[PDB]
């Protein structure tokens, strides 16, 4: 979820995770990626 994503040092994105990060969870009712 967004809270845990950001508090665990990730970023919520709908787009592909940017270079040097990868998907670790979701945000926004499942519709976005947690990228770290």
Do residues 36 and 29 lie in contact, with contact meaning Cβ atoms separated by under 8 Å? no
For 11, the enclosing helix (H) or strand (E) is: strand 11-13
Q: What 8-state DSSP symbol labels residue 13?
A: E
Q: What 8-state DSSP symbol labels residue 33?
A: E
CB-neighbour burial class of residue 10 (10 A; exposed 0-12, middle 13-18, buried 19+): buried
Q: Which of 19, 15, 16, 13 is nearest to 5 (CA)?
A: 13
| Residue 27 to residue 4: CA distance in whole angstroms | 9
Do residues 14 and 29 lie in contact, with contact meaning Cβ atoms separated by under 8 Å? no
Give the experimental resolution in Å.
1.4
Q: How far is CA 32 from CA 6, 7, 9, in A?
A: 13, 16, 16
Look at residue 29 and give its three-state secondary structure. coil
């Amino acid at each position: 979820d967004h809270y845990n994503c950001v508090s665990s040092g990730g970023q919520c994105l709908y787009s592909a995770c940017p270079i040097f990060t990868k998907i670790q969870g979701t945000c926004y009712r499942g519709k976005a990626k947690c990228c770290k």
